[PDB]
Subunit: 367 residues, 4 copies
Amino acid sequence: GPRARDLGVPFEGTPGALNAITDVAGVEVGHTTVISGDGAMVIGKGPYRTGVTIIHPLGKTSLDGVAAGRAVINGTGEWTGMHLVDEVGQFLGPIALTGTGNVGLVHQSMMDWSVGKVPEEALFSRLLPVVAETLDNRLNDVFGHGLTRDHVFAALDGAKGGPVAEGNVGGGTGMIAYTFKGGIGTSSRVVSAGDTRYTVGVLVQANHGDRNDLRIAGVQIGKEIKGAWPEVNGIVAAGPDAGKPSLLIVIATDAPLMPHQLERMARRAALGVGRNGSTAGALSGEFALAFSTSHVIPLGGKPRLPAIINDTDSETMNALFRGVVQATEEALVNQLVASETMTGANNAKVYGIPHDQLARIMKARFP
Amino acid sequence: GPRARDLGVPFEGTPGALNAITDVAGVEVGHTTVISGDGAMVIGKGPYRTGVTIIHPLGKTSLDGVAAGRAVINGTGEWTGMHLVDEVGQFLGPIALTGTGNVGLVHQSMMDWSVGKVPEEALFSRLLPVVAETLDNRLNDVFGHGLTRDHVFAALDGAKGGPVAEGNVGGGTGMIAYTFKGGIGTSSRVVSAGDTRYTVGVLVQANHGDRNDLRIAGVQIGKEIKGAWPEVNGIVAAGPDAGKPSLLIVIATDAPLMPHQLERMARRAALGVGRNGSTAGALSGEFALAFSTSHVIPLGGKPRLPAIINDTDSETMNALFRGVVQATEEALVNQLVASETMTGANNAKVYGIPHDQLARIMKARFP
Amino acid sequence: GPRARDLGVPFEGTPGALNAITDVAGVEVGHTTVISGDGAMVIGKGPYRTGVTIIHPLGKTSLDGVAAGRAVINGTGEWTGMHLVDEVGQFLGPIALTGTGNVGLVHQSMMDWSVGKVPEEALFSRLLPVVAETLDNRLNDVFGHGLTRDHVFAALDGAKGGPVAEGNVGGGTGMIAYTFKGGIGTSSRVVSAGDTRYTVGVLVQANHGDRNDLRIAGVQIGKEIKGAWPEVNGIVAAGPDAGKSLLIVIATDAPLMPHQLERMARRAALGVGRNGSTAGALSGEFALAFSTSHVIPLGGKPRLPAIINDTDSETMNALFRGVVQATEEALVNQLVASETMTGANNAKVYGIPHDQLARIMKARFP
Amino acid sequence: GPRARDLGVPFEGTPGALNAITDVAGVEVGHTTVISGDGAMVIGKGPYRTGVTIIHPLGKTSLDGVAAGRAVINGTGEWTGMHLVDEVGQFLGPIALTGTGNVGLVHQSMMDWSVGKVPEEALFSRLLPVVAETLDNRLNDVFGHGLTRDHVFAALDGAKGGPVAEGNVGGGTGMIAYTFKGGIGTSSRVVSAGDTRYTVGVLVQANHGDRNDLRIAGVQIGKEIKGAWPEVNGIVAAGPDAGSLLIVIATDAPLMPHQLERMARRAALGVGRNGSTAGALSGEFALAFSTSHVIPLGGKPRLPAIINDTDSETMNALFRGVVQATEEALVNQLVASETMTGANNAKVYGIPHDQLARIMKARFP
Ligand SMILES: CC1(C)S[C@@H]([C@@H](C=O)NC(=O)[C@H](N)c2ccccc2)N[C@H]1C(=O)O
Ligand SMILES: CC1(C)S[C@@H]([C@@H](C=O)NC(=O)[C@H](N)c2ccccc2)N[C@H]1C(=O)O
Ligand SMILES: CC1(C)S[C@@H]2[C@H](NC(=O)[C@H](N)c3ccccc3)C(=O)N2[C@H]1C(=O)O
Ligand SMILES: CC1(C)S[C@@H]2[C@H](NC(=O)[C@H](N)c3ccccc3)C(=O)N2[C@H]1C(=O)O
Ligand SMILES: CC1(C)S[C@@H]2[C@H](NC(=O)[C@H](N)c3ccccc3)C(=O)N2[C@H]1C(=O)O
Ligand SMILES: CC1(C)S[C@@H]2[C@H](NC(=O)[C@H](N)c3ccccc3)C(=O)N2[C@H]1C(=O)O
């Protein structure tokens, strides 16, 4: 289907070939999407609209660490492995993005997955898995154990490079963003740092923001779109006619950055988010994690840093920073466009942002 | 002169009466502006385009502390008294915003100022003054001692409530923002938290960003404006026709917030900055400090907290957060509009964003 | 069993009645201790030497939050709920301390425990459980699913005030500290803060440090102790004859704000420092402090019965000294409470010898 | 005179040749010590008991940056240049340690010092000087402008390697630690990291702690010492008869910035060994830097070797070095600082050498 650019939304900068986080060499992505049941929710019996998204920084067979740094916009949420990142500037294993109710199950499943796949002596390196959440409470039976260990194994083992599925998939399945359907979005930038061009890739799991704040390409678009407010049982449940008939950001780069430099990359995510108008609600867990696929730490070995960058080198750093801002901005709009209307638990209905209206608005604003 | 709204720039939200940080009860602002000399720079002899801006959270006569919390967007800069704020959640004395070369002089001057005004028993409370900088290196003889202790005393003693002077004044005098003239800007929002309305006021000293990134009301306006690039000696010095013929954000609120809650307010500034397009350059020291004028700590006494707010109360917190984002966004545009064209050290000429073109663009975009 | 003071170890300050975290009124502690199997390890079959320790800040029936703040000494470990604490200065629900392999199971079990006990409208408040770990890898089948949901429920439901069991129990069951047996330890201080008194309670799950660095009451005691090095099947496995993480929970009834509780938590490092360890590269050493008087009713107005000035040295120094001293003592109490244990792969770790310790203390403090 | 070891205080580990931060090659230290006036304080006239201590990480002629990271024990104090360090993991120029009242003067003086010495194109790199304080308020006329630009220039220009003067010198001149005389202290450790040796050097400016908490070599010694309490005009002013800390860590280990933060976070453990509990207004800070991981101005960073954070053999050796050198630097300070009378005739005693030596002899036969 069309992505944001295909509907005429302009963005600044040059995307990588896939315009996705997988433009960064090494990165694989996998989703398991769990959609079952309709109507009234009973805890433990669905409906389920949930899942898990896996990102392997160096592919699924890697036992090595990647240099990493994080940032917090608003920390009302969970992201495990982050004390490790703060302390030693790297993490081992995959990143899992999922629904809040699944964190514990995913965390233990990743440990289980390592058994028989990792040398015994190396197993202890698999004991701080990285698992993050947003809450799919409006569309999904959160507490009801809809996600199984097999679902997690399937995402771990099925992850791959190449085009990344966006929208109502994996961890984003039951999410809501800007009062429209939330989900997964991704984008990349190839940025010129003098005579070297690096790739910055971003994947988001979006469950944040309000329709009234939303900007797409700078256009405050909430009031321009007619209808498409959420419903319950065929009754408008939000907006002017109500009653009538968190954000996870994962940044990959092939730039050979040190961990403190990656924290800097992570802190740029907030500027990209800011472009699109949201203001970080009190309980919106908005977090960013950045890693390098060129600065790798072989397990029990010497760190591999193929080149080294000066933080005060504006030509290099600004190109990277702008890449993060732009790819984050675009990943967020790509999510909205990829996400289709869904009806879930308790008959809650949330519309995907209307393509026809969006394209019409973009054409009028950008003749 | 006209402020941003007067030129047809739309913003969301409701400003306070003055649309300035002084809409928050207790707050006084003072500037001393130093403009002397023209032509080639000789270190120690100008030209000078610098100054200092003072913000008294509770007025110039207060010996008490205000609850406070900070945030960093990019920390390549100086802001003293911040270890204190991080540790004990309050600061004593005024906030000074100035040029980088002035920090030491301002810091000692603020100590000198307390002598004779503050009981010898309370003097030690005046020994961690709050002084922050952006670099006026393109228009000002930074190292040349253009700022005097008397200049600092004048700003401390002359500060007042009511309308706040914007543009090329005080600490902002010699600054450059988005490749246009930088300086001081301010805005406020009155925000509804249930049956209680709070005030959020913001003042910025802006020296950040690139013209190519600039958004005003979502409009990427750099390429829409014709000319007005900086010059040297009548020769265009930047942009397409080149060669041819940091950010300090101060947030005040009357909301009775605890220090950790004010950190949250400070972290919202990045989103407001994000709206206007900048991407935080490698050497751009972009910082935010938030304080409450209702949560006051009498010197050596019991903290006064007139009411208490739950962090998980979205109705109250989201109103405050949106206030910070909107006031920050507008304060940044207000700065640009207030700042006039200036020629400074080494005949560097930086244009104020052209009012006529800006108004024309806003009219075409927002009929 | 004797605790540290009973063996003649001197400490500074005044302990509470129970000399435990439960000296802070309303705090409840529960353990489930899992000890089964012997001999060679088979992943998935044990031997198991693990468990879980639960701390209910306001008791097991509370749905309210407590003001909270944390500190990191060395962050190579997991402690969930901590982004929440950093952001909004409070956490809901119990603290669980456990073995690394159990984190996910405990996390989901805590959610399950809320279902049926918590009004449906309030359930979302139970979605960021606080769970922390140290690694019982030398005595326990870490990956082998030895801990069950029922074990977690039992600790949650069985938690109580009063005296706290120490040593090889709950989360500390399979741990190793200063090359001796690790485990759970607790201590408290009653402090004079201006013209009121407050209690500072500390509980530790200790799995950190090296014998050669250990100080007890300032005495570098590792070299003064004879034998008691770990073994594997009869063969001494460390020390001169070889081949022949730390979780700190601080409770107080002082009405502190979140940022002030961060300051409390940052004092733990000083008390840790007193006892000699130097925080190894992979030693996850963490502290979390909460107030039981500054409470946040769910969806309501925070309750702060009095307010303290950070610059009030009389009040704050007393509280800080309390943390340092209670931490120092909790660490030694752990060592003394922990008995010799043989576990997975016939690994054997000795409890610090009571007779030698008492002897050394007697000679050092006649 | 004697240092702590000379009075029979035992410590763990192996000190460098100088037992000082200057065991890290290329580091230079300079003090300017300002002692003048006696009797009653009149603000602006003294008595003065203050000064400044300069540490040049790569020597005074370096225009380059050093990789760096910091830690806070209790942040009630000032240390400039630290936002820079947190953000970009390096700092340019010298570290200055001084009295609280002097921070602004020192900060501007460091800028002035660069003019004429640094190419104009490079001057902007000199605009975030690193200046830290503790408060000499009981012995010194803090607000009275006792420190001059010339004093600062002298410490900057006079700094050198080799032995480092301790006690009542430079920034530590008017300080008070554990209710005894405070000041400057330094120590070092040479550590074995697998098949390589590194040096960890520590210098402190100590103005912290209470006598009742003090431990030296594990001995709670405040109560074993008789008298030596502070006085004001012949009248005991503390104790039964009453009728902040800056830690600089240098290493030649090629550590990245986040790794140096870990080093800095070890300082608290060494502080903890000596008993203090970090008072509410005690600004206790640590800064660590590498002299081998250097960043040529406007150039490519130079990292001669790289270390894995999970390499316990290498990291643990370094961490223990910080802890031990911090512990010893604190005791070296006390022993180096002599009894001093200052503003308002306040008198603060150096920890008594005779009593300390006897206590150590009794505890460690
Ligand atoms: C159907 C709904 C999604 S619309 C909603 C309505 C009624 O209270 N409130 C909102 O608009 C609310 N601000 C909101 C809407 C979307 C995402 C987050 C918050 N009721 C919901 C639902 O029942 O889950
Ligand atoms: C006159 C000038 C301001 S324009 C500039 C031109 C030539 O190199 N470069 C820039 O555009 C540069 N990106 C820039 C411009 C403004 C603010 C920050 C960076 N030369 C300057 C000057 O000499 O001070
Ligand atoms: C219902 C909400 C108040 S919480 C939810 C979401 N926040 C998260 O997902 C976050 N990680 C989180 C916070 C608290 C507990 C568990 C998880 C957000 O914001 N949503 C609100 C909404 O739908 O309006
Ligand atoms: C010339 C610059 C590289 S530094 C300057 C400004 N940055 C600051 O003001 C900041 N607080 C700072 C950083 C370093 C030393 C002293 C102060 C920024 O960015 N400017 C660049 C520009 O004009 O292009
Ligand atoms: C085997 C070790 C290298 S890891 C262990 C312990 N550290 C922890 O428990 C910590 N939370 C952790 C770190 C990494 C993965 C999982 C858990 C520590 O230190 N131990 C060493 C030892 O026994 O020698
Ligand atoms: C007089 C004190 C209350 S402040 C002082 C010292 N703390 C500092 O030096 C610190 N950097 C600082 C804190 C506040 C203002 C200025 C400087 C400390 O503790 N001293 C107390 C004491 O002597 O009793």
